[model samples]
Target: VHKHTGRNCGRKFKIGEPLYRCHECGCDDTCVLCIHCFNPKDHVNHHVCTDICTEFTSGICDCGDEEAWNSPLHCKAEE
Candidate 1:
């Protein structure tokens, strides 16, 4: 797991899970949020993007529909 600070979501801790990028948020490109955090409070009416592949994260999701923006990080569990 890892710890990171969010601009609006505040401090967050996870296992480096893949995050959804709120493209509509004006909080720069740093507004990466998990399924739990992607809600109306922060990412309301925002376009969530695909998984952010990284050394510590794992997941994949075609974030084309705003309806599935709040869905979980669709990815295979770490092997």
Candidate 2:
């Protein structure tokens, strides 16, 4: 395991494991996800696109939170 910053999942991800954010998300850096939960697909109501952040200093997964994402997005883990 690597010493990464943080995620909405509240875990430290190692290398090879990546983090993601949505360009479409107006919330900016507040919104982020893990490679596994990173879904840049056209979900209902809100459309999503992704930008890869190879390494981030510190952040929390914005999934399922209105503060970060326009629409609350709940991935498998958060739900």
lDDT tens readout by residue for model 2, 1-79: 3123234455445544556666566478556676555554535445454444446545545554556766555464432
Looking at model 2, the pairs that clash are: 7-61, 8-60, 8-61, 64-73
Residue-wise lDDT of candidate 1 within 1-79, one digit each (tens)? 2222221233333455556676655244543555544444444465767464466554333222234334433221211
Clashes of each: 0, 4
lDDT of 2: 0.52
lDDT of the candidates, in the order given: 0.43, 0.52
lDDT measured at residue 59 in model 1 versus the true structure, 0 to 100: 33
